Design a protein around this ligand. Structure first.
Ligand SMILES: Nc1ncnc2c1ncn2[C@@H]1O[C@H](COP(=O)(O)OP(=O)(O)O)[C@@H](O)[C@H]1O
Ligand SMILES: Nc1ncnc2c1ncn2[C@@H]1O[C@H](COP(=O)(O)OP(=O)(O)O)[C@@H](O)[C@H]1O
Ligand SMILES: [Cl-]
Ligand SMILES: [Mg+2]
Ligand SMILES: [Mg+2]
Lengths: 233, 235
């Protein structure tokens, strides 16, 4: 029992007795594109929290610095408390969704090398897509910081892409958040579940949140499958 | 004036010459809004525009900027070097206005220091979407060293334009360049620099450009003329 700091779409965050520490609670809320249509859909909290806890651990083993300490419940994990960088970092392996729209090209077209993209994590501004100069203007980060957020998201793509391959899923794109820890460094934060990445079945089947949005089945089913496959590592 | 069409634009019909390397540009009386959505014929516009562009482009040539400009042919026409256009629209911002205002949710009118440059892919089917460096490399438009060149040039270009407009009392909020390749493969400033293509605030905050058309604040040629007049007071 401790205090609720922030209340999200997918996560409520609580405090502890350790200033630098935070317990994350994954909710059953699901919400669609920016025009937040809201459905609450059972089991989702637990799968997300499992999957995220797993990958994050795997990353930590692979020496990626992150906010993960331990999965504490079905519903909760304990995380290092960081100061969030309002900058969603998207790395794309394949064309899909908003890249596809922006460039009027289909989804499924491979890229090589992969493209990263910043978005201003500002719900009020509808999390707009931005360029490096916009980030500097916003004073989120200068140079050296921008080049770090890239250089490590790529390293993160390289680990993750391999891992999902091995379980027969192609990492189409994902989305990080990073923040500063009590010691000032930058650190992979938030969560890595099917909610913030795209996953393609070797037959084009969507093993991700595009099931809720496009509406091609029930969510917990594909998530369940991904969770099942991950323990193959 | 009699040769064949190379392509029709919303503002400019560009014709051929006997000189493979040279283009004669024809400025039209047509004005088009947002995503080509609404358009009107406004008399004098092409002429008014044609002088402004020829004048600025001349001044650039004398201040050492490579451009596609050779001479003004007449009211409606000028002669230009043929370029393989770079389908990037390059926007430099000095003050906030319009789209930057939209995306970042703040007022038209705030000084930026430094000025922000922004690429859009010149592709009307896509409504010239806003793109970032890595999209340009994707799109196969330019390599790094070149994107860096487009940047550094649009900057020293602002640092001339801003002054000249200052001296006649005009606030260069933002503009929008286009560059292309000349006969010897050198990047070169081209297209046009009219008030269709930039923002020029009055000291009273009055709109000395196409925002008069967009926001329908009144008629375009009044203002365009006032700028032509003012520009003629320079050197
Ligand atoms: N280590 C951390 N310290 C502080 N805040 C965090 C940390 N990790 C994630 N967060 C934030 O917790 C919030 C969780 O709510 P969530 O529903 O994920 O947000 P969103 O609705 O933006 O997706 C997010 O705004 C995220 O930035
Ligand atoms: N020197 C040049 N050589 C060849 N094409 C040019 C040159 N300068 C401009 N252009 C192109 O000619 C067209 C001019 O039509 P315009 O109405 O200005 O285009 P838009 O409707 O895209 O604004 C544009 O596609 C522009 O890029
Ligand atoms: Cl955009
Ligand atoms: Mg989130
Ligand atoms: Mg044009």
């Amino acid at each position: 029992s401790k205090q609720l700091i922030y209340s999200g779409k997918a996560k409520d965050i609580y405090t502890t007795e350790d200033e630098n520490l935070i317990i994350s609670t994954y909710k059953d809320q699901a919400t669609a594109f920016n025009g937040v249509k809201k459905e609450q859909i059972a089991g989702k909290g637990v799968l997300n929290n499992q999957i995220s806890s797993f990958i994050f651990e795997k990353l930590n083993v692979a020496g990626v610095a992150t906010h993960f300490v331990e999965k504490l419940s079905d519903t909760e994990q304990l995380n290092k408390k960081v100061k969030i960088i309002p900058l969603e970092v998207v790395l794309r392996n394949y064309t899909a969704g908003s890249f596809s729209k922006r460039f009027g090209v289909d989804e499924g077209i491979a890229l090589e090398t992969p493209i990263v993209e910043f978005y201003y994590k500002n719900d009020d501004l509808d999390d707009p897509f931005i360029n490096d100069e916009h980030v500097k203007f916003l004073q989120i980060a200068g140079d050296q910081q921008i080049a770090y957020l890239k250089e490590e998201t790529r390293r993160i793509n390289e680990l993750l892409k391999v891992w999902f391959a091995e379980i027969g899923l192609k990492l189409i794109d994902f989305k990080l958040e990073f923040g500063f820890d009590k010691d000032g460094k930058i650190i992979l934060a938030d969560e890595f579940s099917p909610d913030n990445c795209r996953l393609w079945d070797a037959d084009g089947n969507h093993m991700d949140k595009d099931v809720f949005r496009r509406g091609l089945g029930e969510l917990t089913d594909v998530y369940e499958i991904v969770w099942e496959k991950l323990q193959e590592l």
